[PDB]
Amino acid sequence: MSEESQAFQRQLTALIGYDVTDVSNVHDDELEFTRRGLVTPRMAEVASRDPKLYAMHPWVTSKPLPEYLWKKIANNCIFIVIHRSTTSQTIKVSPDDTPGAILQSFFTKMAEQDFVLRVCGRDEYLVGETPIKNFQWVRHCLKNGEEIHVVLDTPPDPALDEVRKCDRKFRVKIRGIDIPVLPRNTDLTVFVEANIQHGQQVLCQRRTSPKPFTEEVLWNVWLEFSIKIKDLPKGALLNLQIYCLLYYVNLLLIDHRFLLRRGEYVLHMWQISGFNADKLTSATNPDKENSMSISILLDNRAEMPNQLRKQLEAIIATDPLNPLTAEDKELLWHFRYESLKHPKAYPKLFSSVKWGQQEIVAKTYQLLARREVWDQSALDVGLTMQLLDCNFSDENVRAIAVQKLESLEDDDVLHYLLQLVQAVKFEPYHDSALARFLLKRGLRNKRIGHFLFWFLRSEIAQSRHYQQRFAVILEAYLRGCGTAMLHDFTQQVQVIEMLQKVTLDIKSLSAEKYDVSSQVISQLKQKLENLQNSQLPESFRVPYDPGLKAGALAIEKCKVMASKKKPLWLEFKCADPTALSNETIGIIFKHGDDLRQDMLILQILRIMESIWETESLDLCLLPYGCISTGDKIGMIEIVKDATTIAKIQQSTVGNTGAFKDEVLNHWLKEKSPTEEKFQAAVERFVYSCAGYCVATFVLGIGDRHNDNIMITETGNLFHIDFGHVPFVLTPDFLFVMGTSGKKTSPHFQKFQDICVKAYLALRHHTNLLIILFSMMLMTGMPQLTSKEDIEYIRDALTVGKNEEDAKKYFLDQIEVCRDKGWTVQFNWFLHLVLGI
Ligand SMILES: CC(=O)Nc1nc2ccc(-c3cncc(S(C)(=O)=O)c3)cn2n1
């Protein structure tokens, strides 16, 4: 309302990367009515959250403790070490011992209860009445089986968490277009195309008379559609598309209020080149110079026979991307209530609901009137997401899913945070039950609120079609999470803006081909000194690792990796005085890359291992951290003590000269200090390899540029860059099992058996993996075919083929590999250096 209360706005913006008060892509005020429509949702939670509990965010699960670890509780008890300065006693603890209570046997049994347990090094806290074993720092420690180092210090000041308090038939008059600069070849023709849409189910389709392309065409032509006015389903999208195809733009038919839209509109259009989710937007081209601008006028019980119920659960058991027939659609829609009893039919039910009719929609709501089983039913997350995807426009159906997501402990939302944040490009309006459920859970704790942030900031920054929508949603969150949190976002905003002024100053002097002249590194450091003068603030949180405080600059260790694009190998002194070791913080800082792709893939992989935990299985997939910090630029985790599969073959055998086999087995032997740990690492390698097969194959990215498979000095391995044979299983890996070439041994005997037992494990979940993939492509990738590319995963998971068929299929897929050798990788070798 005044001078100091207007300076707040010039900050938020600087942090969002878009001025939410700038009006230059706006035919109305859904804009505000979203922001406003969010004050309540915000400060409703803001208040509701326990302030001490917000500030101490104790990462806690409630899932059953893993059988490979619960059995692995050898002595049947746990041990915890606690520090001060010098003194640091070790303590015996029971898998019941409250993290609160383990001081009532340390301040009474060793000697008042106002200091809490932290973790040595991190911004973590172990507080609350949920057993030790239910802490995800502890689990992750015991999983890998480490010592547990705590340091006693005050509950942090949660006073900083302070918040800055007619009715017949539809028509539309297409009036013209303008595209100022047009020249390319010679004479072409053009026409517009208006469609009624309710979730890519296209109620109608209409054309105009083809008039030759001059720079400023005209028609003045109405478009009398077939379907009625009252029979228009909410979340009606009017698709407008110029054909030559060519250009595209959209308009919601119904208003966010409810008003059937009216008036004159100078909507600007996006260009197309050569489907994708980024094609169902409510926002237009915010450049009013080189864009096309179309001008318009708007002036307005169920019980049945046997071989029907049978020839129906058939339709139930079908995978999600399996087609449905008019034949199908009727059987379902008819048995409606008999179709409710099985939740495993819900997407498939509402798909079979053409929403043209007024009457049907109301009957469809009488279907929800007795939502009965769905509410009381076992939560299956896949079946839930499947309802929040591309296909459903109805602001009631999408609400039935969110309703079921409500019941998820943080550690689960965290697993799925990415794809639901991506899934907002799909709710048809702005203000939406999910859009909120996001803002909600994200204020309910801290650790969601962080990841939320850069997830939003990633899409606000590079993705034009959603910067409006996401910038509103974010702005709403940033205001209401307290400067306490908000002064770490400030840190991390300055610091990458610093790590840009340089990355792009170094990006200046590139000859072209892979090189790093003195010239370029000499300056790398010399630059860093002015980022070391009143511009970095002491430290900053590691974007991908919330609790990690990256601090001071190791300028002597920063470099510029020879790689094609020029990243920066930077390292950082952890600013935590109560650390435990002394390796710094290596962080790759690339640029010229869109990261949302790599980033989304880690969240697949993870889910794949969380799935395997329910089967009681481990495969060691090391999915490093990665984040899209701003525009065509981000930063990636540096996994200490690892190397590439490329450098190794390079380090024993010559330039490209052949590919010797045993090479690999020694590299480990020579990095194993103890006589044992060569077996202990082989234990970790075989398990680690098997996952980067099932997964690398299911996702269908298993044959990868030779230079891009990595491996820790500790047996474990992990595929790195996901820039762009069923899977990489090269002869040397086979030799690390005990097979020189098509034989079997007590470790390979295991290899086969692990992949498969895991493949069926992952198969017993078919549906989930598909509804990801589909969303994953829609929100992430280029020009994916709404069949072809979307399909592949169907084959990989081989729906239908009963267990004994697929169990062989994978065992034989290993054979598909075990017949090619290096011939693949060597073809990737000579793919480099003279192969036009
Ligand atoms: C010891 C080491 O170098 N470890 C390590 N860990 C990782 C994890 C990820 C990546 C990486 C992943 N994607 C892309 C890149 S880049 C800098 O080529 O764009 C690098 C590279 N490394 N390197």
From Swiss-Prot:
Q: Which residues carry this modification: Phosphothreonine?
A: 766
Where does the sequence pass through the membrane?
none
Residues annotated to bind ATP = 586-595, 621-629, 718-724
At the top level of its lineage, which domain of life is listed?
Eukaryota
**Any idea where this protein resides?**
Cytoplasm; Cell membrane
Q: Where is the C2 PI3K-type domain?
A: 166-299
Tissue pattern of expression reads: Pancreas, skeletal muscle, liver and heart.
Q: Which SUPFAM superfamilies match?
A: ARM repeat, C2 domain (Calcium/lipid-binding domain, CaLB), Protein kinase-like (PK-like), Ubiquitin-like
Q: Which UniProt keywords apply?
A: Angiogenesis, ATP-binding, Cell membrane, Chemotaxis, Cytoplasm, Disease variant, Endocytosis, Immunity, Inflammatory response, Kinase, Lipid metabolism, Membrane, Nucleotide-binding, Phosphoprotein, Serine/threonine-protein kinase, Transferase
Annotated effect of mutating residue 763 to P:
In IMD97; loss of phosphatidylinositol-3,4-bisphosphate 5-kinase activity
Q: Name one GO cellular component term.
A: membrane
Cite the EC number.
2.7.1.137, 2.7.1.153, 2.7.1.154, 2.7.11.1
* Annotated region described as G-loop, given as residue ranges: 560-566
Q: Which residues form the PI3K/PI4K catalytic domain?
A: 554-822
Segment Catalytic loop: which positions? 700-708
Q: What else is known?
A: Candidate target in therapy for inflammatory diseases. Selective inhibitors and protein ablation are anti-inflammatory in multiple disease models such as asthma, rheumatoid arthritis, allergy, systemic lupus erythematosus, airway inflammation, lung injury and pancreatitis.
Q: How does it assemble?
A: Heterodimer of a catalytic subunit PIK3CG and a PIK3R5 or PIK3R6 regulatory subunit. Interacts with GRK2 through the PIK helical domain. Interaction with GRK2 is required for targeting to agonist-occupied receptor. Interacts with PDE3B; regulates PDE3B activity and thereby cAMP levels in cells. Interacts with TPM2. Interacts with EPHA8; regulates integrin-mediated cell adhesion to substrate. Interacts with HRAS; the interaction is required for membrane recruitment and beta-gamma G protein dimer-dependent activation of the PI3K gamma complex PIK3CG:PIK3R6.
What disease association does UniProt give?
Answer: Immunodeficiency 97 with autoinflammation: An autosomal recessive disorder with variable features. Affected individuals have childhood-onset antibody defects, cytopenias, and T lymphocytic pneumonitis and colitis. Some patients may have features of hemophagocytic lymphohistiocytosis.
Q: What's this protein's name?
A: Phosphatidylinositol 4,5-bisphosphate 3-kinase catalytic subunit gamma isoform
Annotated source species: Homo sapiens
- Top-level taxonomy: Eukaryota, Metazoa, Chordata, Craniata, Vertebrata
